[PDB]
Every structure is written in structure tokens, then in C-alpha cells.
Amino acid sequence: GTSKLKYVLQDARFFLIKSNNHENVSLAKAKGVWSTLPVNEKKLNLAFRSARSVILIFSVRESGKFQGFARLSSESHHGGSPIHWVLPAGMSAKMLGGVFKIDWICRRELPFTKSAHLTNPWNEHKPVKIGRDGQEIELECGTQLCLLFPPDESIDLYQVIHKM
């Protein structure tokens, strides 16, 4: 069903994540972590304290798809085991030093062709697929986008709900 999913998304904030490569999204799905550049890291940390749920919606550049979405379960932290991110050109490991823990809500993909009817008021009403890494997605557009994903029957949102 979708009722627990809607409860998790109630009054959530949504952020678009643009990964330059598939490897890092696969690592994130296996390990339940994400790292981003400092400008977005600060924004996510602020958002985490402000809303019952902060949702990251992942898209790998050039893939034409979203690869899933996840909920922040922590603010960023430094000093753990260095995550073996594949680093884009010009990006240093220190730039991804802050690690967020995430709980995946859906690990299925969604093609951009299926979200063409959704525009983001916080990015000039451009289709929600369009946006820089870290672009915030307005509540209604983000909720509807998440509800477009195929159900991920492997995930039990009961544990997620208890962290809210």
C-alpha cells in the first residue's frame, strides 16, 4: 500500500540529488549513506532540524531516470571510515567529508518521461527532473514525484516511522 508512505511524506522537505556516476548511488543504496558538497551539506543540516522528514531524490546524470529516494536519519558527521566514493573531476575527498546516514524508502527507478507533468515552483516551474544538485523541491511537487515511483516491496516503513 501507500498509506505508510504518505505518512512518512507528510510535511516533509524534498531535495534533488544529482550524482555524476552510478557507482556512488549504488554505494549509497548498499551502505545507507550520502555525501554532498559543503554548500548543500549546510542546507541539508538546516533542513534536518526543521521537518519531520528530509527526503533525497536521487538522479544519476545522463541516465534519464531517478534511481530512488531516501530519508535523512542524521545530520552530517565527519571522522568515520572514509567512504570510497568515485570522485568527479575536480572534486576532492575532503569536499565529501560530511556523511549523512539515510534510510531508503524506494530503491526502484523512475524514468523522466513519467514525471514530465510535474514542475517545481522553487526552480522557475521547470520540470522537476531539471535542477542543480541540492535543489529543493516544493512540498506538493515532491510528494507527487515520490508517489510516482513503483512500490518497493522490500522496504518496511515501520522502522522509518518510529524515527520521526
Side-chain angles (χ1 to χ4, degrees), residues 1-5 7-30 32-51 53-61 63-80 82-93 95-100 102-113 115-131 133-139 141-158 160-164:
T2 63
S3 306
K4 287 209 285 299
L5 176 54
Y7 181 85
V8 172
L9 298 182
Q10 202 210 325
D11 224 28
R13 297 178 71 171
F14 303 83
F15 293 86
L16 184 66
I17 293 306
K18 285 289 169 65
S19 181
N20 278 29
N21 54 69
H22 270 295
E23 288 51 51
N24 289 355
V25 167
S26 169
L27 200 163
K29 287 177 169 179
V33 289
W34 189 246
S35 295
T36 190
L37 284 176
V39 57
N40 290 334
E41 175 184 11
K42 287 191 185 73
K43 289 167 15 168
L44 293 186
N45 280 336
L46 282 171
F48 180 81
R49 315 156 184 151
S50 83
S53 296
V54 178
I55 304 298
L56 303 188
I57 309 181
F58 287 83
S59 174
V60 171
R61 288 191 186 283
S63 65
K65 306 174 188 181
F66 303 97
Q67 280 68 37
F69 57 100
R71 185 186 173 280
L72 294 189
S73 66
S74 95
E75 296 191 8
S76 75
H77 291 117
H78 306 63
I83 291 153
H84 293 155
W85 302 122
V86 171
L87 300 169
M91 193 176 296
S92 77
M95 295 180 218
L96 299 181
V99 176
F100 298 84
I102 61 175
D103 289 309
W104 284 88
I105 301 165
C106 170
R107 286 183 181 88
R108 312 268 316 260
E109 54 183 44
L110 182 80
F112 288 166
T113 54
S115 62
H117 64 285
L118 294 175
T119 54
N120 183 5
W122 302 153
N123 194 31
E124 300 189 8
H125 293 289
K126 294 172 174 171
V128 65
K129 77 180 178 191
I130 302 298
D133 185 51
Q135 165 77 52
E136 189 166 2
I137 301 162
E138 176 272 334
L139 165 71
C141 168
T143 301
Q144 286 321 310
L145 174 55
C146 283
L147 290 176
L148 290 178
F149 282 78
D152 191 338
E153 283 143 38
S154 76
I155 290 176
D156 190 344
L157 294 188
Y158 175 86
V160 181
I161 283 176
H162 277 9
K163 315 183 173 184
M164 305 174 58

